[PDB]
């Protein structure tokens, strides 16, 4: 598991449930083309993305539908959805992990990069 | 103006109007002791809490009192209040903006600070 | 001036001077059409990206390059950009600011909208 | 384990490893008391502070010494420490984490209250 989201909701104080969340790898036309999508658990988690074997160097966007998960629940949000936009780097052994703070307003991203 | 205080409602995406905001700083003795007060203006300022004269050196505590902001509203937030506190002007005098940005279950803050 | 961009560096707690922001709107066709461009002036602000009439409804997307941000201050950060991505204007013209504080590894952004 | 604490490191894109927490709880003469506290592990995180037996309701304060861990690793920060204060509250079966992100001029917390 190279590559796990994480989110949370800074209204309710909880995990933020069933986001769903698209990865997608930057062609070589510069394109963006799917490469994994999910939903986040009950502990606003999403685990099973890629494998080390697929995870290859490369830019890399992670979509989160923010809009979505905000109207599922009565809240008028801001933003479309929220977009990560990094380059994953092959200097030794290494996790991604993507972790999103959802406000309606406003969310903050932040990349724990271990091991 | 050394000392200015601004607040923004992450969950409206507006200035976060009529907030009380306690300043205090750390006595000889180490006591708290009350340094300055006010409230948020229409947006989301504070401004007029001290003078040059009066901010000297020492450790200071910015009391936000994002409770009786989110109460007034109709939420029940996490947090009682949310603290900032610095060593300030142990280098000579400089501005402090301190920021703060709330949620009902989370705050950040931010020190913008220049010369 | 109905668009504003502001951006604040929280390493050093200043206003993050001279960073590149792109502006672009979907287009009737679902491509992102270049709308405007910019960089923050010394107070981390950028004004002027547009006018009320060039202004229209949409789904804007602002690009700020927080990655040449901190690679010319001798950083490799973690995202290639932060994207912030929104739908404007659709009850009618509203004021945009779109705040974002930046890290090595992290940002927040938060839109304050008004009338 | 109803209280647990969870730092990460903005700069670094890592937990923040060996910062400090003391917890304390509000007395009835208003003073601070020592309630539990420990130093934050290879993960970023702080098990084992409390029991559900011991953990009450009432006011609790969360003092995480940042300031130490950013001089340790020879950054210049703003803050003396971040505090979060909240009131524990029993409706219901809940955890709490209390999760902090750190950058040397700012921070965000936010509270997870789950089950």
């Given amino acids: 598991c190279p590559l796990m ?3 949370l909701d800074a209204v309710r104080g909880s995990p ?3 986001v769903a969340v698209h ?6 036309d510069d394109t963006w083309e799917p ?11 999403l685990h099973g993305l890629t494998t080390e074997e697929e995870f ?3 830019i890399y966007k992670v979509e989160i539908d ?17 977009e990560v936009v990094f ?14 703070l959802l406000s ?12």
């Fill in 35 to 45: 490469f994994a999508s999910g939903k986040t658990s009950e502990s606003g988690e």
């Fill in 66 to 82: 923010t809009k979505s998960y905000w109207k599922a629940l009565g809240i008028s949000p801001f933003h479309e959805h929220a």
């Fill in 87 to 100: 380059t994953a780097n092959d200097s030794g052994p290494r996790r991604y992990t993507i972790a999103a």
């Fill in 56 to 58: 290859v160097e490369g």
């Fill in 23 to 28: 990865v997608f790898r930057k062609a070589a």
């Fill in 104 to 115: 309606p307003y406003s969310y903050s991203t932040t990349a724990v990069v271990t091991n």
């Fill in 16 to 18: 933020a449930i069933n």
């Fill in 5 to 7: 989201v994480k989110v």
